[PDB]
Amino acid sequence: SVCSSEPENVQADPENYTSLLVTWERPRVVYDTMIEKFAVLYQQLDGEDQTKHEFLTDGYQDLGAILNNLLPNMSYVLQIVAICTNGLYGKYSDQLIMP
């Protein structure tokens, strides 16, 4: 059902107290299609506003995204999923959780 395996080695690496460098590796397997782009989905873990957001990358080769305006000392939970050219979606990365 999935159009690719999960993006691998998702690293968070805080740049500072408010910016997150999200990087990943291309899915190892892509099924009968091509990857068009990636979505980074994230939401606060603590606090009371558990609304999830999403950032879309430009293109299929830039394996990263900088997430800014992250509240300092707040914990966030993130997932990355590939968007394939045939409209299917890949396997969601492992969930990952600011100084």
Partner: protein, 219 residues
């Protein structure tokens, strides 16, 4: 000889040196600026300075800025002529670019009727003209972009294009051509790619990048 100190391979050709091989050229015709180059004297009438060749993967192309600035390798085998040299040559007049590629018996090419590389202060930005060829126009993606290496990231991607795709190039985010990438590497976008000819999961086993003055078409 009509040109005592030829400044390009086309002037060698006019002198009667119509055999491909190694020749000296003299930038702006001045003897103190001698450079050793390989001249392709057969493609489309000859007269091309070859500035890059891949053909067997025995030479490492995953090098740093200083290496790509000065040049490396053997001009009779696999090599990169050097960005400072390419800048100085393409500043002599209007040059054209030709990329010739082969996969065994199948061949293709791409040509651009303007070609220049800017100077170091401008990070050797690529300028190309109008396309003709059979390989498809994969290099126009890279128009106006600075050169990047694994140790000097000038791309506009969050990632380090040169590190991720095992090469050195005028990367944007990231590439449709990767001719200094990893020899024989089929992994997506990491190999020697010319996208519109063979896609991103095929590494081209032979490629040559070469340049000639536009005005050689008049002669």
């Amino acid at each position: 000889r009509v040109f005592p100190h030829p400044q390009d391979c086309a002037q060698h050709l006019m002198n009667g040196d119509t055999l491909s091989g190694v020749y000296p050229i003299f930038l702006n015709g001045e003897l103190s600026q001698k450079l050793q180059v390989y001249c392709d004297m057969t493609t489309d009438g000859g007269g091309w300075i070859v500035f890059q060749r891949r053909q067997n993967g025995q030479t490492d192309f995953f090098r740093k800025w200083a290496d790509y600035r000065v040049g490396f390798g053997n001009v009779e085998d696999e090599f990169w002529l050097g960005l400072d040299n390419i800048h100085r040559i393409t500043s002599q007049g209007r040059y054209e670019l030709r990329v010739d590629m082969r996969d065994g018996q199948e061949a293709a090419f791409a040509s651009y009727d303007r070609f220049s590389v800017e100077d170091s202060r401008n990070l050797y930005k690529l300028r190309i003209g109008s396309y003709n060829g059979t390989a498809g126009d994969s290099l126009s993606y890279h128009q106006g972009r600075p050169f990047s290496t694994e140790d000097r990231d000038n791309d506009v991607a969050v990632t380090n294009c040169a590190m991720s795709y095992k090469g050195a190039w005028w990367y944007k985010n990231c590439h449709r051509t990767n001719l200094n990438g990893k020899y024989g590497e089929s992994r997506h976008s990491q190999g020697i790619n010319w996208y519109h000819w063979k896609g991103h999961e095929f590494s081209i086993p032979f490629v040559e990048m070469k340049m000639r003055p536009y005005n050689h078409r008049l002669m």
